Amino acid sequence: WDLVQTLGEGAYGEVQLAVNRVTEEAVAVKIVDMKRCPENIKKEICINKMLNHENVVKFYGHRREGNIQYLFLEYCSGGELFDRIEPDIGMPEPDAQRFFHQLMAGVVYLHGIGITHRDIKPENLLLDERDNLKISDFGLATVFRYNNRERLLNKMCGTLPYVAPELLKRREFHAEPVDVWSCGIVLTAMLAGELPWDQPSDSCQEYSDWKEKKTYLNPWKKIDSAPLALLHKILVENPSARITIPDIKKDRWYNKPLK
Numbered sequence: 664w665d666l667v668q669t670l671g672e673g674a675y676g677e678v679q680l681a682v683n684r685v686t687e688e689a690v691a692v693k694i695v696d697m698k699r700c701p702e703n704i705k706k707e708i709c710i711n712k713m714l715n716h717e718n719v720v721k722f723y724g725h726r727r728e729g730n731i732q733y734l735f736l737e738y739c740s741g742g743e744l745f746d747r748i749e750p751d752i753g754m755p756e757p758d759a760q761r762f763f764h765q766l767m768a769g770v771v772y773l774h775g776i777g778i779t780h781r782d783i784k785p786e787n788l789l790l791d792e793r794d795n796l797k798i799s800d801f802g803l804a805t806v807f808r809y810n811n812r813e814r815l816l817n818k819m820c821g822t823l824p825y826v827a828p829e830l831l832k833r834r835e836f837h838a839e840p841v842d843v844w845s846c847g848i849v850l851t852a853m854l855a856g857e858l859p860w861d862q863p864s865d866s867c868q869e870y871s872d873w874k875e876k877k878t879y880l881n882p883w884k885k886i887d888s889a890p891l892a893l894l895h896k897i898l899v900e901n902p903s904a905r906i907t908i909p910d911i912k913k914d915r916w917y918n919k920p921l922k
């Protein structure tokens with residue numbers, strides 16, 4: 664394999680595009696220099712070897728080589744879902760809905776084999792050539808159920824505007840509804856083209872305005888009542904009152920045929 668261009672850097676390293684010379688196959692390569700991490704990078708591989716789904720970025724292999732680690736990962740040639748949300752516009756409601764469905768199938772599968780991605784946001788929803796959505800990056804993901812026994816979480820991980828309010832208050836919390844919340848901030852982004860708030864916290868006027876049901880404001884006013892009816896159920900402060908993926912699957916707007 665040989666490295667063509669540089670797809671998305673940041674911290675852990677870079678995903679670079681790599682095309683093989685002879686075979687006519689291109690598939691991305693995360694590059695991690697452990698000088699910082701060795702016990703973390705083996706957790707992402709652990710968790711990647713578990714995964715196999717049409718809505719999750721496939722894993723292929725890895726080669727440790729000195730301080731360097733290479734994670735060979737399915738190439739998603741449609742880029743990020745971040746780059747298809749237009750500022751203060753968002754996207755066509757029928758495209759929003761199609762992506763939510765494929766997003767609920769990826770997380771329904773994760774949750775079923777006891778993984779939680781923990782940092783779901785548009786940057787981490789890649790897309791293939793036929794524009795099917797894939798869940799990407801499991802280096803913050805973790806095992807919230809093993810041998811049919813659930814472990815509540817307590818560590819603060821994620822990105823502040825997608826994170827669930829209980830992750831800043833409660834000292835321990837279930838992993839599933841934190842993924843359900845993130846997926847609802849992603850639904851507001853796809854239909855509103857802005858993120859509602861910095862963080863779901865209490866000295867934050869925007870979140871306090873949502874809890875007061877001031878939907879006559881941004882971003883909620885750019886969203887139609889059907890899919891705003893559903894967001895009302897996902898972005899609930901109390902995790903045990905919050906909706907679940909089987910009850911999203913029966914939502915009016917989730918099963919509404921959109922043009």
Ligand SMILES: Cc1cc2n[nH]c(=O)n2c2cc(-c3ccncc3)ccc12
Nearest residue numbers: 670671678691736737738739740741742
């Ligand atoms: C950050 C990241 C991880 C990744 N894993 N697998 C992939 O395809 N990517 C990425 C692919 C792109 C991309 C960029 C331009 N055109 C198509 C795809 C960008 C970032 C990533």
